[PDB]
Amino acid sequence: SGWTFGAGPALQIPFPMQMAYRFNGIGVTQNVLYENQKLIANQFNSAIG
Amino acid sequence: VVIGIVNNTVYDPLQPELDSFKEELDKYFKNHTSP
Amino acid sequence: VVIGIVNNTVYDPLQPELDSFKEELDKYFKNHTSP
Numbered sequence: 309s310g311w312t313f314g315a316g317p318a319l320q321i322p323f324p325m326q327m328a329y330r331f332n333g334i335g336v337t338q339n340v341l342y343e344n345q346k347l348i349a350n351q352f353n354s355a356i357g
Numbered sequence: 358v359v360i361g362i363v364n365n366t367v368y369d370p371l372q373p374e375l376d377s378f379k380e381e382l383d384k385y386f387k388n389h390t391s392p
Numbered sequence: 393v394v395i396g397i398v399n400n401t402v403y404d405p406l407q408p409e410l411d412s413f414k415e416e417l418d419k420y421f422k423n424h425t426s427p
């Protein structure tokens with residue numbers, strides 16, 4: 309659901325577009341998400357292990 | 358490289374200007390080469 | 393459906409650049425069709 313479920317009804321969102329709404333809150337746009345989505349996943353998969 | 362994309366037509370706010378005038382300028386072009 | 397709105401003439405920022413070309417195109421239309 310993202311962040312909406314803490315402030316009302318839970319609105320389901322697909323997880324590829326949740327990063328696009330969380331890069332945009334930093335100052336860099338969402339253009340740098342889908343262009344290199346696989347290496348972001350590999351940087352995220354190896355981090356938790 | 359993007360996944361999950363779909364096909365759709367997209368518009369521009371210039372055809373409310375140009376495509377309301379390029380047809381008008383083509384109408385003037387009809388009078389331009391009429392004789 | 394709004395309280396206290398004021399009539400005014402909102403300008404268009406893309407209007408006068410093409411409007412200056414309108415009489416330039418009409419100059420070609422006058423220079424070609426009439427003679």
Ligand SMILES: *[C@@H]1O[C@H](CO)[C@@H](O)[C@H](O)[C@H]1NC(C)=O
Nearest residue numbers: 322323324359360361362363
């Ligand atoms: C959603 O996931 C399923 C399961 O793998 C997949 O078959 C489907 O293609 C995915 N949807 C899109 C739009 O890729």
Ligand SMILES: *[C@@H]1O[C@H](CO)[C@@H](O)[C@H](O)[C@H]1NC(C)=O
Nearest residue numbers: 359360361362363364365366
């Ligand atoms: C979009 O259209 C192009 C050509 O018109 C085609 O090659 C492509 O597979 C289409 N993509 C989808 C998701 O329909």
Ligand SMILES: *[C@@H]1O[C@H](CO)[C@@H](O)[C@H](O)[C@H]1NC(C)=O
Nearest residue numbers: 393394395396397398399400
């Ligand atoms: C604005 O213009 C319309 C139509 O010309 C007129 O009916 C109206 O009284 C004007 N004034 C307003 C909305 O304050």
